[PDB]
Amino acid sequence: LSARNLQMNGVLGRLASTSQELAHYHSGEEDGIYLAYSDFHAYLAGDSACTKELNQWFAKQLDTGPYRLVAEEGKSKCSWVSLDDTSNMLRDLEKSQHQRVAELQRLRSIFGTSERQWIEAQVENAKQQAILLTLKSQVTSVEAHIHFDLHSLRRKHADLVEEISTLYQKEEKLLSETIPELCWELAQLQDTYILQGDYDLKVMRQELYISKQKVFINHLVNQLARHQFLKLACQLEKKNMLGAFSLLKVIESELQGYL
């Protein structure tokens, strides 16, 4: 069993101080933790550049966005006196073309003929002949009811209907003197809402960004958040390297018991 010592000492005794030259190097480790940090610090030329570009992909829109998407906001209310040239000039050929509307073709035609025949309504009810039953049956009208005499000039005729005599006219004020108003009210009585969607179309057109507004800038703040989560890594460099710096003394306590 004594031969174990002769076998081990010939190979074990080779590590020497270069194995533990962590103390011999230790100056290089104190700034080395910064040297790896310095390589990250040396990447500031790109680190300060990659943060700007990612801030600039959404900010690529400055002219197309900010300088344009509040331009017509500037030409939204303060231009209500002047929008016709500030931003309507691009929209000029449609605003007036859509204001006239194509409904005019089916509106005006020859009227002298219609004024004679076609201006009149047409009947769809056949209640006029309701009397033609009692009209022919005079026996129950003059010989049976016999509610009449020489004094029945108006008292009998008022028995069936008297109150309706005053509640008769309801659809007046269009029979005469309404003629001159055929100038403008053509598209305001039945076609009142002739073009109530021209600017409502803009409202949706202003809103046509929802395919990506669900992201919009949610990614940006999270992209700022997420890319932070990656590169914050010196957090543990400030306690364990220090153990290789400050706690590294503890190896002298090993020899304290022997000494």
Partner: protein
Amino acid sequence: MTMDREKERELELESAMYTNCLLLGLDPNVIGLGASNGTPRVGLFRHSNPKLGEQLLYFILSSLRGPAQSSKDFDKVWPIFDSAQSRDFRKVVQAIISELESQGALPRSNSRVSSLATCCGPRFVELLWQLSLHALREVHRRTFPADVASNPLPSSLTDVSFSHAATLLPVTKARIVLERRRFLKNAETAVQRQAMWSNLAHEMTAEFRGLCAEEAYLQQELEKLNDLRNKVKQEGEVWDDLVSSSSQNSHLVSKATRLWDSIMARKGQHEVLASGPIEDLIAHREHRYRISGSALLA
């Protein structure tokens, strides 16, 4: 100037008073009155009176001097013929001229008594002068008395009453009113005489403010101040009257005006009315501010 204006108007009135009144007006007066101071007549009556007057005064009656030369010239010609013996023959003049005022100029003498008044006494100087000139012109003045006895033989004594107009030839000192009124009806002769025609100083004779003096020079260089325009009026007044020249004037002015008179004079009358299209081009931009922004701004 204006003496060029008097070339032919002086041959019918200027020669109407002097040629006749030279011998009855004052010549007998001055001759008879010359006896007191007769020194100039000594050196003149020899030749100036009878001979020197032949060039001017004796040619007036030369038309009738042929047939009736010796009418009254005999009283002067005959004494002259005896010039070689004129020393011993000098007392016959006053007698040979007495008949001149007694037969030739006897009616004339009656009119000439006023001119004879200062020389009726001194007839010696007067009849001597009468020999030289008065008798010679009386030959002209004796034509009327002499011709009566010859030409109007059937009407000799009958015409003596009608000869009152013809009697003026001897009695020749009351006809001055003829030429006196003449130069009013024909004051169109000159101004230097009793007439007037060479008158004024602003538009007739001394119109030298540019009119008369220049008019003399309007034949050499002062007429060139304006008339040269016509040559440079080749585009103009020279080729005005000839329209064919005017037609080729436009053809030949095809560096200055032919286009204006032939390429666009044919359209210049209906051309100016297109200034309206200038306004129409810049009139449709007014409604780019009000319509859609004020469709219901009111």
